[PDB]
């Protein structure tokens, strides 16, 4: 299997792989290794994939279930990863952004490390979920610390409205720096997988309003732990199921 | 020539044309049309290009003269109108480039911000020592469109203090650099880019791990900007 | 007749020679409205004669009677024009109040900011009305900035834009040069134009008890410089 | 006979029952030192005697002798003033108040994430360049106090835009009115402030009126952060 780096901090393309549910366990393994190391990986020309064949291949990586955000973070046990397939694409626009929340963290100045390591945020959905997540989580498989924030954040705990907004923007500025991100131009047969535990993503609304359809499969993740081993606190449950 | 839209607010790719200083006027005019409407145009497969070839093709467009979002050399009063840029040797990964539409940014402003910007002036400096008060809104000499003039050379706004100047600057830079208003170009060999420096900002991305990278650029002479009441930029230090 | 002393270059005055009450002189009552309009906040010392009925009585000769930086209940379309406030029992330390001059704040704005605010509208809710961020003063014709802590947003702007711009404005409005901080003493009475000021209490007397009696006059609806109304 | 009255709950006191000069008892000049430490800025009314030689004489009793933006005195220096003495000479007919803010109370009240940030944050001070901690430990009281103010040009390891934003977050907490005192200057007024645990700010609301004050600024040791580290010069 070939994995080519697309950027120094994030992104990688993978070929020599016909995505589907009957993959050799060692191919599935090299893909995961790449996914964890590159945060978002891309597959071209998987015109063969359909909804069910895609659902089947995601079953191999884990347990199936605009603006900058990590997926569903208003819930305590939000997704670990997602498999997204292009199905109907607009003649122009419709490209997608991802940022590396692990690298964002590692690159912090130590003062900002100390602050984030001790900062918690309340994540809300504008069904009513409210959750208190650490701003730094320890990645369950890599041990890498990653910044947890994004659009679902409503406030930092213990801080006033003004300071919350301002610090949020400071961190979002560092996460979404172009050097730390990748913009993907979708072509038919394109497939994207990303580690929702070490990324944020953002749809770009620049196909005016043509027709756009992508299919998505989401894998189960677990509750974030901060650097001291404390878990996210649910304020308005409940967890995600299945 | 055939022109393909890359995004709803900025960018187009043009096929059906070989680049040289011997192109048909009817083709040069379709390209200037295309550049003016799309703000940045991309040509692929232009392998034949070469320093003097490229320089000769920029000549049909005007008179020949990075990691921070900016408009080219705005610390000068009559800064460049346009640039033609060619990749020579590219890194193995990374090394893309961003452009944003400062014309579309102005048009989308909320009414109160239109007022503010229409009456605001910035001091652009080269941090030789250039200093130039520009309007924050310039009226484009060919399209008549209003466009935002800011970017990384803006040292401050006229009649505003540092704290408010830095805060308003951000508010403006945020709207200009909205992903819906930008294009990010993955460079390939044979790639040429042309942008209207009078209606855009650009930003190089440093993510090829300081591999080696070479691009050739020809810049074209531009006019002094005029605000929406017909007043022109003022020099404080330096010459055209 | 009476006396008026400037407490600062942009705001506040102290008036001497007057015994506040409902039997007060027409000329007196007139030099006071004059002083209030001109100086935005006015103070009288030594008024130990006042109870609530006489404070009111006097509020009637001026008009019609009824924390964080703010203008009084702006989330209301027709919010109060002016207040009459006296100390009842003060703490032993702290307890001072701030006023800021919104009219001078406008005047001092750079043209770019003038043009912005003359064209800006804000959403004022509680704890819901849209006002001009500049209102023409129904008596002085002075232009004044109408913001303050009741603002939830600016019409047409997004959340990051609203906050950032509100702070820019509030920072100019509450600039020390443009405010007055009053140290209360018994017998003290403050009168201010709610249509040309913001005010803020200071919570710096710990748990001591602090008690004030206030009468509020009726204010009209703000109109912008285009004759537009909330 | 010497009485100290609190002026606000977080900052300020007036000291009555004292005439200033070089002749005060050790115990008196010590009553003054302790009030200064605990209240951060202290005021003396009706001190019509003092002159430019009486002030100096008194200053030496507390130490070793030597504007409308919130700041801490001369922080572009590695070893700035520990305290200053200020007397009114000629005052405008209106305005001319002064503001002080308590940088010890401000630190103490930071939420813990901010404490963490500030205990580890360092600032560059330029009028000359110097590197101070954002939290300094006070030589006498032990108190941790915020070291910021207008002479700060940037934070170490943060970019221009980041520095600015955080600087304002800090300043906003330091200059909160509950944490400040605004002194209305009267002739014969003497103010004394601890420059190691305060910021101060002149208010410029008296138009074109000559405001004449006379200051005696005492000597101060170099700052250390919560790890015993010290300020650097650049």
Author numbering:
A (entry chain A): 4 to 68, 94 to 154, 177 to 292
B (entry chain B): 4 to 68, 93 to 154, 177 to 289
C (entry chain D): 3 to 68, 94 to 154, 180 to 282
D (entry chain C): 3 to 68, 93 to 153, 179 to 285
Show me the paper's own sentences about this structure:
By contrast, type II sulfatases are non-heme iron-dependent dioxygenase that oxidize the C–H bond alpha to the sulfate ester using α-ketoglutarate (αKG) and oxygen as substrates. The resulting hemiacetal sulfate ester collapses, liberating inorganic sulfate and an alkyl aldehyde, as well as water, carbon dioxide, and succinic acid byproducts. Here we characterized the single putative type II sulfatase from Mtb, Rv3406, which is the most highly conserved sulfatase among mycobacterial species. Rv3406 shares 54% sequence identity and 66% similarity with P. putida AtsK, including both the iron binding motif (His99, Asp101, His165) and the arginine residue (Arg267), suggesting it possesses similar enzymatic activity.
To provide additional support for a role for Rv3406 as a type II alkyl sulfatase, we obtained a crystal structure of the apo protein (2.5 Å). Attempts to obtain diffraction-quality complexes via soaking and co-crystallization with alkyl sulfate substrates, iron, or cofactors proved unsuccessful. The apo crystal structure showed a near-perfect backbone alignment with the apo form of P. putida AtsK’s crystal structure. Both structures contain the “jelly roll” arrangement of antiparallel beta strands present in other known non-heme iron and αKG-dependent dioxygenases. Rv3406 has two disordered loops adjacent to the active site that did not appear in the structure. The homologous loops in AtsK are also unstructured even in the co-crystals with substrate bound. The active sites of AtsK and Rv3406 contain the H-X-D/E-Xn-H triad that comprises the iron binding site and are highly superimposable, including binding sites for 2-EHS and αKG. This allowed us to model co-substrates and alkyl sulfates into the active site of Rv3406 based on their empirically determined orientations in the AtsK structure. Due to the high degree of structural conservation between the active sites of Rv3406 and AtsK, we speculate that they operate via the same catalytic mechanism. In Rv3406, the polar head group of the conserved Asn residue was oriented towards the solvent, creating a hydrophobic surface in the active site that might favor binding of a nonpolar alkyl sulfate substrate.
